[PDB]
Amino acid sequence: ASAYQRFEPRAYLRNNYAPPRGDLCNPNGVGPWKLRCLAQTFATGEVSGRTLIDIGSGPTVYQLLSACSHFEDITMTDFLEVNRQELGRWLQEEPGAFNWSMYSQHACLIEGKGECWQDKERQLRARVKRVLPIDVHQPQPLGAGSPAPLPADALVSAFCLEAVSPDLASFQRALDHITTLLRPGGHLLLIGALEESWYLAGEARLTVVPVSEEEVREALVRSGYKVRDLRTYIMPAHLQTGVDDVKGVFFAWAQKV
Amino acid sequence: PDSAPGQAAVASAYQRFEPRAYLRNNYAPPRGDLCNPNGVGPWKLRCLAQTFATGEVSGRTLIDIGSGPTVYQLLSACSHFEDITMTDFLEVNRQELGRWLQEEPGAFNWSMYSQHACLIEGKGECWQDKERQLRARVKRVLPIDVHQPQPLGAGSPAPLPADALVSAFCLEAVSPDLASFQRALDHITTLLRPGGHLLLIGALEESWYLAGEARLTVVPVSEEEVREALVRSGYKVRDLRTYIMPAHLQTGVDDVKGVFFAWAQKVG
Ligand SMILES: Nc1ncnc2c1ncn2[C@@H]1O[C@H](CSCC[C@H](N)C(=O)O)[C@@H](O)[C@H]1O
Ligand SMILES: Nc1ncnc2c1ncn2[C@@H]1O[C@H](CSCC[C@H](N)C(=O)O)[C@@H](O)[C@H]1O
Ligand SMILES: Cn1c(N)nc2ccccc21
Ligand SMILES: Cn1c(N)nc2ccccc21
């Protein structure tokens, strides 16, 4: 964890959400694939309710772009103060906020409701009620007296669990911890890196547990979920850039039984 | 009657036309707000998109008539024509297009329109690709006077005859009266091949608009007058739609009551 104290949000954003990984023009790219997974899942109309919590949001909002129109109360979270501040800058439209508009545009494009990207962002900013500290290693990841409405009707989390866990076991426990935040019959949308061991965020060099699709499937099962959907994106050569060693990205739609 | 005087007044008035003021008056918010699906921006784009989506309007060459400083009218068209000719009476408008073509920062920003076109075309295209294709496909930007029997002049560079014509807010805005309008329509029709298509957008019952210092006269026309002119010019009218300007889009930049869209096909 101490490694995360060197984590630079801007370097992370630049490494993963600016070209080439952040060019959304190519439909075969990872950015479009992720947004498409999220969009399609919400378009089924089976993931719904009043409140949602995003786990380990970091400095990113793309993971909620499709979500925000299904949940009137959204709580975003991260372990790091610097990440929560970077979120603030975007949520409050403060100077030097990250430009997510390519992702907003592409989400509007994929969803196919003819919505302008500005309305999309407006709705996201309006529904994100609070940004809270979190530690998925604690049995109560949000603390004891959290301002967050619990239990949530739905969880989202992207690139967090594998990226903060030393090994499979710690990964499984983290999953158990966040699962307690979710109402029975509720939904989890989980995005993660496949077979990754490290990545860079400026001066920070972080350790990642290398996990497979079957390992992810089994963990979800062991945590008491029914796996509704589990998809893999194999990382093409051109998006393997020296900022990490990720091999693929997985998307899992799980329902707490 | 005699047309020269009226046409001379038009030419004179346009010497004060200010492209930036025009762009801001008509293509920046609220008229340029593409978020409201009931707004005039989305309606125009939809009309053009849907028309091209029939697949009935294709060919190799397209001529946009009186482009002015705008490109929105070509956003859906550019997927269907490899060779596009843009045109305008005013050099300053052609320069404005020059800026956009060169992708200069000082150029007007059409990205809201590009994105929206991509949104309704429903092909998952990013707006940067839409724009890159339009820039690639614009082969020339030429002077034009619709009041001349040969609007492009004698021996123009443009591929003639064209397979398709586009024209937005030009004819009525440069014609002193309906007779002049009809002649202008007759003139541009000589540029279209038999069997080719005209997509025409225009103001209904407009008599004036502002472009900075310039205040310009417009012949007020109705939908029925437009239909009859198209028939009179040798077209079969395939589609003619009317958009009624809502009060909140009537901003004192003009006295437009509505916008027409016409899809017409030249007989032959
Ligand atoms: N012990 C812990 N508990 C919960 N989140 C943690 C954590 N240690 C680090 N994090 C956060 O986990 C994130 C991994 S990076 C991914 C962030 C974002 N959700 C994405 O999709 O890009 C970082 O924001 C990091 O600060
Ligand atoms: N005699 C003439 N022949 C052809 N175009 C003319 C003309 N006199 C003025 N114009 C052009 O007619 C245009 C009307 S404004 C409309 C411009 C653009 N097509 C749009 O949709 O906004 C101006 O650009 C003006 O310069
Ligand atoms: C590992 N990883 C993170 N943390 N963000 C990403 C975006 C695209 C591809 C891989 C990514
Ligand atoms: C008359 N007119 C022009 N010339 N451009 C317009 C855009 C929207 C609505 C009306 C318009």
From Swiss-Prot, chain A:
<dbReference type="GO" id="GO:0042423">
    <property type="term" value="P:catecholamine biosynthetic process"/>
</dbReference>
<keyword id="KW-0949">S-adenosyl-L-methionine</keyword>
<comment type="function">
    <text>Catalyzes the transmethylation of nonepinephrine (noradrenaline) to form epinephrine (adrenaline), using S-adenosyl-L-methionine as the methyl donor. Other substrates include phenylethanolamine and octopamine. Also methylates normetanephrine.</text>
</comment>
<dbReference type="GO" id="GO:0032259">
    <property type="term" value="P:methylation"/>
</dbReference>
<feature type="binding site">
    <location>
        <position position="62"/>
    </location>
    <ligand>
        <name>S-adenosyl-L-methionine</name>
    </ligand>
</feature>
<dbReference type="InterPro" id="IPR053384">
    <property type="entry name" value="SAM-dep_methyltransferase"/>
</dbReference>
<dbReference type="Pfam" id="PF01234">
    <property type="entry name" value="NNMT_PNMT_TEMT"/>
</dbReference>
<feature type="binding site">
    <location>
        <begin position="56"/>
        <end position="57"/>
    </location>
    <ligand>
        <name>S-adenosyl-L-methionine</name>
    </ligand>
</feature>
<feature type="binding site">
    <location>
        <position position="12"/>
    </location>
    <ligand>
        <name>S-adenosyl-L-methionine</name>
    </ligand>
</feature>
<dbReference type="InterPro" id="IPR000940">
    <property type="entry name" value="NNMT_TEMT_trans"/>
</dbReference>
<feature type="binding site">
    <location>
        <position position="196"/>
    </location>
    <ligand>
        <name>octopamine</name>
    </ligand>
</feature>
<comment type="pathway">
    <text>Catecholamine biosynthesis; (R)-adrenaline biosynthesis; (R)-adrenaline from (R)-noradrenaline: step 1/1.</text>
</comment>
<feature type="binding site">
    <location>
        <position position="83"/>
    </location>
    <ligand>
        <name>S-adenosyl-L-methionine</name>
    </ligand>
</feature>
<dbReference type="InterPro" id="IPR029063">
    <property type="entry name" value="SAM-dependent_MTases_sf"/>
</dbReference>
<feature type="binding site">
    <location>
        <position position="244"/>
    </location>
    <ligand>
        <name>octopamine</name>
    </ligand>
</feature>
<keyword id="KW-0808">Transferase</keyword>
<dbReference type="InterPro" id="IPR025820">
    <property type="entry name" value="NNMT/PNMT/TEMT_CS"/>
</dbReference>
<feature type="binding site">
    <location>
        <position position="158"/>
    </location>
    <ligand>
        <name>S-adenosyl-L-methionine</name>
    </ligand>
</feature>
<dbReference type="GO" id="GO:0042418">
    <property type="term" value="P:epinephrine biosynthetic process"/>
</dbReference>
<dbReference type="GO" id="GO:0004603">
    <property type="term" value="F:phenylethanolamine N-methyltransferase activity"/>
</dbReference>
<keyword id="KW-0597">Phosphoprotein</keyword>
<dbReference type="GO" id="GO:0005829">
    <property type="term" value="C:cytosol"/>
</dbReference>
<protein>
    <recommendedName>
        <fullName>Phenylethanolamine N-methyltransferase</fullName>
        <ecNumber>2.1.1.28</ecNumber>
    </recommendedName>
</protein>
<feature type="binding site">
    <location>
        <position position="17"/>
    </location>
    <ligand>
        <name>S-adenosyl-L-methionine</name>
    </ligand>
</feature>
<keyword id="KW-0127">Catecholamine biosynthesis</keyword>
<feature type="binding site">
    <location>
        <position position="78"/>
    </location>
    <ligand>
        <name>S-adenosyl-L-methionine</name>
    </ligand>
</feature>
<comment type="similarity">
    <text>Belongs to the class I-like SAM-binding methyltransferase superfamily. NNMT/PNMT/TEMT family.</text>
</comment>
<feature type="binding site">
    <location>
        <begin position="135"/>
        <end position="136"/>
    </location>
    <ligand>
        <name>S-adenosyl-L-methionine</name>
    </ligand>
</feature>
<keyword id="KW-0489">Methyltransferase</keyword>
